[PDB]
Symmetry: D2
């Protein structure tokens, strides 16, 4: 795809608040867009050590890094040169709601990301606010074409310190500055993991691998 090299650089900035607590973050990283892998070194610049689980911000911290087959239009690689944006509502089973908005642009080999986050109504004595989470499980997101843009839906499961799971629903919208050849309905298979965390809980390395594809299960109706 035009102006997308085998290895790309990432610059990220994030600001916002969760349950009365304001914070700011920055990200330095790289990855292989065609191989579908990426890494991000995240420093928390404002708001000290977070009083809530860092995990609830992980989804917000670039679908450019996604392995796409020849047969399926890659919305994200097409949209990058002209720029694109995404917005998300993440609704947790115990009451928490995390809203996010993001702008993505390209300057040379640098993918610059600007994120705004707003979270409210997280149970004060729940796993998120008490920092009793242990990273997300792998998941698969449904990519739905909707009027010029995309709508992505997922039900990711967050691992808990007690050995259980906290689930949330995700609804993500995508809008491109330029007009792009839309894909048919398909899936993203994700695995997002925290590799390293600094002692003071300020610096955290996050990795992600993404494979895009149609369903693996055969059709009786000749459908994808």
């Amino acid at each position: 795809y035009p102006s997308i090299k085998e290895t790309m650089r990432v610059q990220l900035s994030m600001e916002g608040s969760v349950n009365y607590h304001a914070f700011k973050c920055t990200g330095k990283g790289e990855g292989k867009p065609y191989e579908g892998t990426q890494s991000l070194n995240i420093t928390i610049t404002e708001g000290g050590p977070l009083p809530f689980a860092f995990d609830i911000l992980s989804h917000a911290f670039i679908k450019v890094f996604a392995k796409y087959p020849k047969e399926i239009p890659d919305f994200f690689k097409q949209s990058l040169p002209g720029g694109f944006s995404w917005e998300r509502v993440s609704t947790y089973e115990d009451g928490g709601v995390l809203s996010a908005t993001q702008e993505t642009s390209l300057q040379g080999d640098c993918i610059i990301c600007k994120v705004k986050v707003l979270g409210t109504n997280f149970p004060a004595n729940g796993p998120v606010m008490q920092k009793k989470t242990c990273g997300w499980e792998p998941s698969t997101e449904t990519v739905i074409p909707r009027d010029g843009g995309l709508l992505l839906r997922d039900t990711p499961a967050l691992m808990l310190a007690d050995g259980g799971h906290l689930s949330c629903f995700m609804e993500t919208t995508y809008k491109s500055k330029k007009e792009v050849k839309l894909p048919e309905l398909h899936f993203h298979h994700l695995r997002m993991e925290k590799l390293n965390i600094s002692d003071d809980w300020k610096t955290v390395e996050q990795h992600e691998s993404v494979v895009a594809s149609y369903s693996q299960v055969p059709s009786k109706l000749g459908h994808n």
Copy 2:
């Protein structure tokens, strides 16, 4: 090995309920391959005449015994079949509709008997469901989560519309076995449920389904499944 579950198993199903003020009954006669993960069901609407709502909203309610499971992942449904198990579900549509369901699964001979109860409300009067503007479900992936000696299954299936778009719903399904069973770790079901035939008289519909259970095939840096 599962002694009572053969290569081919037969299905006897009964459904009763109502959607948007309209009561109905359905019966199902089917067969499947539990280890291949394939099944077929011949559905006849016995009461409530021709349905005033899209049949597609009943399809998920019409048996996870027919799922291809790998050796390394415990099969809850095959383990639970002899003793009997039940499932319950809330399906929440993006435009207001909510469909509730409860089901009991038991085994008599090689016949898997299913008793389903359905209750749907608040579907918009001029929406695609109540105007029958739906064109079957897309394939989907369901997340299988162990909880409290049972299972919690979560999905975001997409329903194809006559206009060429999609109507999405959220599904949350609970599972309870009568006997204590060995619970699997978190994993996935990859599904494709298709109507092979819809009779012209609105009385009969053949429905097929293939299911594959698996962990994520995307590599882990933490050595996680």
Copy 3:
């Protein structure tokens, strides 16, 4: 309104299931439709001891009994002779969902109610399934006119044994068999209370008072 006396009788039948548990209930009672008051003696006829709190069934156990002012059309009293029906989704903050459908008809002075209920996804160790509820608080429901029928919305709070509250969102639809005159948007002010429970826990007396009204806070735009 025709065929509606000062005092009317009630006959009710309920069937359904909550969290895998099938049950049946019957109701015998009376009330004053214009005074907006009613009493119902509920006997649990099938399903032995209920494993869930009886409180979650209380809303499903007759809007005919509502004190209506002259300036607001009474949908329920208009619809009663010809018959009307209602359907409801009650979504609890901790995951439980109770679905209901009901038919209302008149035979003489006897209001006949046929209810079916389907409840799922209630947390196994939550206050509902552990029966740690203590009746509902009073509430106020918003009556919204919508295409020949009604949509009613409420956010009722259920009192808990611990002293806190468990809240749910209610969305109730109404359809009349004969076309009636729809009101403008207004409110119901409700108080539904259990007055008595039998020693064998099979019989419970439930009382309800309802007052319909526009908002009592003054308008600057001359709006109701």
Copy 4:
């Protein structure tokens, strides 16, 4: 009858945020009678030109200090003003849209200062909010619930539409006080919030609100409030 709360108070407000990709900023100057439960706010959109979405979805975010409280019900908001308090809200619209908000309230002299932050997403691009076909909010009743040292307020307000119908949303708002405050028992807020004057350029909006707090009007047979 409350410390630091005069019969008339002034309001200084700042708002910044975004709805459906569109960023904006707003300032507000106003006044009201706290004990009478009435207030007015003169709002100017300083950044983001004329909003491409309905102004109505911001109205709730634009001060519960202005609420008529009876003697027997503890006034959380008047108690919490001198030390300062904060609130946060999720507003979920029936057609998909979600508006998240956070706010900080403090007092300097007779000036109630408000810092608001808004984030709205997933509103239907062709829905009444994004196409600006709303006609102000109906009056409503909010449920005040005491919950762990603070408050939980729940509401289902109805937004009037241009076609003559309604668009409803669910409101869940939390309140946290800086200082420890005497909590009330469960009760209700009866609100009416109206736009009085709007400029032709859609930059300046005058908003008025009246609030009456009370227990339920309906008699009890159990002797409860």
